[PDB]
Structure 1
Amino acid sequence: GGLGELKRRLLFVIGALIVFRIGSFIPIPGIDAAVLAKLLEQQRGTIIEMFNMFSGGALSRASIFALGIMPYISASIIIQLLTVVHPTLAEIKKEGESGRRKISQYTRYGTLVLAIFQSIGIATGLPNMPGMQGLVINPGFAFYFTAVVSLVTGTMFLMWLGEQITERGIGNGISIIIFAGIVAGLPPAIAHTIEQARQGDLHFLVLLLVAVLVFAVTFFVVFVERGQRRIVVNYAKRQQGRRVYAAQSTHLPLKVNMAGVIPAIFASSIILFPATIASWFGGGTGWNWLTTISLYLQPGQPLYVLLYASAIIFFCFFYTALVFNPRETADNLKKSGAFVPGIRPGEQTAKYIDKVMTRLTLVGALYITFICLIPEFMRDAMKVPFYFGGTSLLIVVVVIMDFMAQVQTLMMSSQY
């Protein structure tokens, strides 16, 4: 706040959020958001609620972003999938950053194609199914083309905003946009909670217990994320071997979390994808089957909570194992002549680190599972609104902690 350098970046990010907000408050022409918002009040609109949380609340308002930034993440999932399966992309990836720019371009183009396909499916399928129940506009090719091009331009401009915040400002664009979109719904929730509290509909003690529990979860997950296991190693004697004296790290820190919201968003996309594709048909055979299997996975249902929990565990474990590389560490200790008591340098050192991280990231994922599990049972028992949900809290905490970590990192780098 004091430094002007970070101040300009802050004003840039905030301003970007302003532009994004104004752009998100503009509904699609020929679409009434009132009947849509009225439709979400039923049980058939509860299944799309979880998908609405990642749209920044622009889904109910029928803004220029239908799916939000989700198709970009899904596009990244598809790109990584083709990278794992097809060796052709893997070869290009090994050609250096020059091929990484190609993977980039193909990821953006894939995002474009997915945006087009999803625009077509959504706009054509759901409204025109009854048809013309929610929309007055006739099911013609004009409305189709209009909706397609509109959602394409919207998603493209959104990606542009994501690139601008990432480049000309601190932190990730997608991260801060999703974060802002999530925390934007908190003040109306609190306001409506207070207004209904004086009506006798909601008890004050309940809200107090909710707030206290939220603060407790906060303090807890903050305490956990900064928790780490350090490996003590004393090296080295005999100063004329051209390695010592260090003047280096006397201990190797090991963090439970990376940390990032990427596994959470990815897992969210993966789990919600079958729920998203089945939510396009409200009536007909979709009501008899697709709507049923859409009710199979619900934020209020324990099954979806357990499945999403397992997804969180798997994605977080895989990501944590992917980011941290014991090879580079072992090579770093080898070139410096570090000898671990405990050990002998080689491949045996890499197996030890993996052995520790396997017993670490596991119980860490168990902790995250618990933290994600509590607010659902709290929502069932205390009847708290959906803005207090566990996923949103996790996203907020991760985003804030990681952003502040990056800030302190930049301040430490600029210091010495």
Structure 2
Amino acid sequence: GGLGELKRRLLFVIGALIVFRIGSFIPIPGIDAAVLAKLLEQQRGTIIEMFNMFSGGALSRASIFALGIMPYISASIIIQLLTVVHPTLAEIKKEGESGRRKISQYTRYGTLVLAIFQSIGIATGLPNFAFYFTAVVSLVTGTMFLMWLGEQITERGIGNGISIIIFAGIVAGLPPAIAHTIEQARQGDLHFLVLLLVAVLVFAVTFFVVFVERGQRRIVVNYAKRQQGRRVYAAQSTHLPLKVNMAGVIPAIFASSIILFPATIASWFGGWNWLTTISLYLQPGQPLYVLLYASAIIFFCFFYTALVFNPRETADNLKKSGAFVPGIRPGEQTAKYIDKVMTRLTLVGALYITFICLIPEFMRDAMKVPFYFGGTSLLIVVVVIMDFMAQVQTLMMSS
């Protein structure tokens, strides 16, 4: 960070999420400001506070991106389905640079029209055609600005752009709720025993996540090399350090977009009793929701991690460099081995993740205390810390 190279990337990201938080306050019609500021006090539907985390306080206060970049991810999965079932997209996806980036531009162009459609869904069902029109216009202007803004953070900014968009979007929604808690902390209105029990549980859960990350699962690999220069004499044991979750950053945001999609389509109408059947089903006070949610998390984590690594490329690499897993045949069998093993790991990873998601709600149902601490946002925050500290160390090895 003391190097201007990464420092300007970070001061690009900071500014990007600062105009994210500038666009987060801009009213949907021309000036509805006070009217909306009344409607965002939730005369109905408290859980909409979750919808204000990913949008940077859009459903909290009056913005141009209402769901934020959540439409994009809802497209990012859709095309990713269409790439699988439809062969014609499966050919363009394997096509290298322009072929993969044309699919990403079709994901961007499906995204913007999905923001049009969801602005149609809101401004038809929930709020009310002049208001409807100003709604659709401000919402597509915001989703477009933010989509550009998050493809700029991937390039001239730090790390992955969309990741940091959502991560800092939820990170920047916290301070008022805790400001009120620490103002009531010099009084004692809400007892300090429950709040310090949750204060120690956030910290010990994050600690357990990062302790399960501390001790790894390492596959011992061996190198036998003596260089022909008669100098280097080498028998080397190198661990391949498998982590319980492989970049658990993105499938978290993905799974969250797939939670909030039926909550957008079903709950904005309410005149549909089936839609409200499933959006009440999908309210996270119920075991049914957590079942559908579990299947979602495991499917998206398995699919995404299976996407990331190519165990045949990794094994062939290991073979090229003159490395072997002792006792296992180089080539295909190393592939099958590391793949089966990585599967057996990542499944456990997505499992303990679905548990960090589910448990806080049963804890809040049993206990008197009733969104940031509900298990989704706790996890995404643990992942902001993990992501930033892994990306800092990767370039601290460089610097």
**Same structural fold, with TM-score higher than 0.5 when normalized by the shorter chain:** yes
Asked if the contact 2:311–2:339 (Cα under 8 Å) also holds between the matched residues in 1, the reply is yes
Q: Counterparts of 2:146 and 2:257 in 1: how far apart (Å)?
A: 18
- Unmatched segments (≥5 aa) in structure 2: none
Query: What SS does the corresponding residue of 1:205 show, helix, strand or coil?
Result: helix
Where in structure 2 are the equivalents of 1:66-85 lying within 5 Å? 66-85=66-85
- For the structure 1 residues 93 and 310, does the alpha-carbon distance in structure 2 shift closer, same or farther, using more than 3 Å as the test? closer
Aligned counterparts of 1:232 and 1:47: Cα–Cα separation in 2? 47
Deviation digits for residues 391-411 of structure 1, max 9, x if unmatched? 111111112211221222123
Note the C-alpha offset of 1:363.
2.2
How far 1:251 moved relative to its partner?
2.7
Could you tell me which of 167, 179, 185 is aligned with 2:173? 185
User: Residues 252 and 246 (structure 1 numbering): CA distance in 2 closer, same or farther, change over 3 Å?
Assistant: farther
Change (3 A) 1:77 1:244: farther
SS in 1 for 2:227: coil
* TM-score normalised by length of structure 1: 0.86
On the 8 A contact 1:51/1:276 being kept in 2, the answer is: no
When residues 28 and 43 of structure 1 are mapped into structure 2, their CA distance, relative to the original with a 3 A threshold, is: closer
**Cα distance, 1:345–1:159 mapped onto 2, change above 3 Å:** same
Q: Is the 8 A contact 2:221 2:237 kept in 1?
A: no
SS at match of 2:272: helix
1:201-240 CA-partner distances (Å, limit 9, x unpaired)? 4111111111011110111111123442122233326766
Cα–Cα, structure 1 residues 303 and 344, in superposed 2: closer, same or farther, change >3 Å?
A: same
- Over 3 Å counting, the alpha-carbon distance change for 1:64 and 1:339 in structure 2 is closer
Checking the alignment, whether the CA contact within 8 Å between 1:343 and 1:349 is kept in structure 2 is yes
Contact 1:163/1:173 (<8 A) preserved? yes
Q: How much has 1:378 moved relative to structure 2?
A: 3.0
Shift of 1:41: 6.2
Unaligned runs of 5+ in 1: 129-140
3-state secondary structure, aligned to 1:322: helix
Cα contact 1:232–1:251 (8 A) shared by 2:
yes
Change (3 A) 1:9 1:248: farther
- Given the superposition, is the C-alpha separation of residues 288 and 205 from structure 1 closer, same or farther in structure 2, using an over 3 Å criterion? same
> Structure 1, residues 116-154: CA drift from partner, whole Å, max 9, x if none?
1111221122222xxxxxxxxxxxx44333322221111
Cα distance in 2 for residues equivalent to 1:197 and 1:101: 52
Could you say if the C-alpha distance between residues 290 and 248 of structure 1 is closer, same or farther in structure 2, counting changes exceeding 3 Å?
A: same
Report the Cα offset of residue 247 of structure 1. Answer: 8.8
Cα distance in 2 for partners of 1:257, 1:243 equals: 40
Q: 12-21 or 371-380: which moved more?
A: 371-380
Once the two structures are aligned, what percentage of the paired residues are identical? 100
Taking a change above 3 Å as real, the CA distance of residues 67 and 9 of structure 1, as seen in their structure-2 partners, is same
SS at match of 2:110: helix
Per the TM alignment, residue 246 of structure 1 is displaced from its structure 2 partner at its CA by 5.5
Contact between 2:93 and 2:103, CA under 8 Å: does it hold in 1? Answer: yes
Change (3 A) 1:148 1:38: closer
The 2-side partners of 1:309 and 1:44 are apart by 27
User: Taking CA–CA contacts closer than 8 Å with sequence separation of 6 or more, which of the two structures ends up with the larger relative contact order?
Assistant: 1
Whole-Å separation in 2 of the counterparts to 1:170 and 1:91: 31
Is 2:154–2:160's contact at 8 Å kept on the other side of the alignment?
A: yes
**Relative to structure 2, which stretch is displaced further, 118-127 or 224-233?**
224-233
Contact 2:118 2:264 in 1 (8 A): no
Structure 2: how far apart are the matches of 1:381 and 1:37?
33
Residues 346, 13 of structure 1: alpha-carbon distance in 2 compared, 3 angstrom cutoff: closer
- More moved, 27-36 vs 243-252: 243-252
Deviates more, 1:75-84 or 1:361-370: 361-370
Query: Alpha carbons of 1:397 and 1:94: their partners in 2 closer, same or farther (altered >3 Å)?
Result: same
Deviation at 1:101, TM superposition (A): 2.4
Q: Decide which moves more: 173-182 or 80-89.
A: 173-182
Deviation at 1:241, TM superposition (A): 13
| Distance change in 2, residues 1:3/1:249 (3 Å) | farther
- Following superposition, the deviation at residue 42 of structure 1 comes to 6.4
* Deviation at residue 242 of structure 1 after TM alignment: 12
The alpha-carbon distance between structure 1 residues 110 and 248, as it changes in their structure 2 partners (threshold 3 A), is: farther
Q: 1:7 to 1:241 in 2, by over 3 A?
A: closer
Q: Separation in 2 of the partners of 1:306 and 1:33?
A: 39
Shift of 1:157: 0.7
Structure 1 position 243, deviation (Å): 14
**Cα gap change, 1:66/1:237 in structure 2, threshold over 3 Å: closer, same or farther?**
closer
Describe the SS at the equivalent of 1:345.
coil
For residues 105 and 233 of structure 1, do their structure 2 counterparts lie closer, same or farther at Cα, with a shift above 3 Å needed?
Answer: closer
With normalisation by structure 2, the TM-score equals 0.89
User: 1:374 offset after TM fit, Å?
Assistant: 2.7
Using the alignment, how far apart are the partners of 1:38 and 1:373 within structure 2?
Answer: 32
Aligned residues of 1:47 and 1:295 also touching (Cα < 8 A): no
CA displacement 1:38-60 (0-9 Å, x = unmatched): 66666941353433332222123
State the match for 2:38 in structure 1. 38
C-alpha contact (below 8 Å) 2:82/2:89 kept by paired residues: yes
Deviates more, 1:91-100 or 1:374-383: 374-383
Once residues 379 and 240 of structure 2 are traced to their aligned partners in structure 1, the CA distance between those partners, rounded to angstroms, is 28
**Contact 2:20 2:56 (C-alpha < 8 Å) held by counterparts:** no
How many residue pairs get aligned? The number is 398
Q: Are 1:9 and 1:169, in contact at CA under 8 Å, matched by a contact in 2?
A: yes
Rounded Cα–Cα distance in structure 2 between residues aligned with 1:23 and 1:237: 58
| Structure 2 match to 1:25 | 25
Distance 1:334 1:184, change over 3 A: closer
1:219 maps to what in 2? 207
Pick which of 43-52 and 107-116 moved more. 43-52
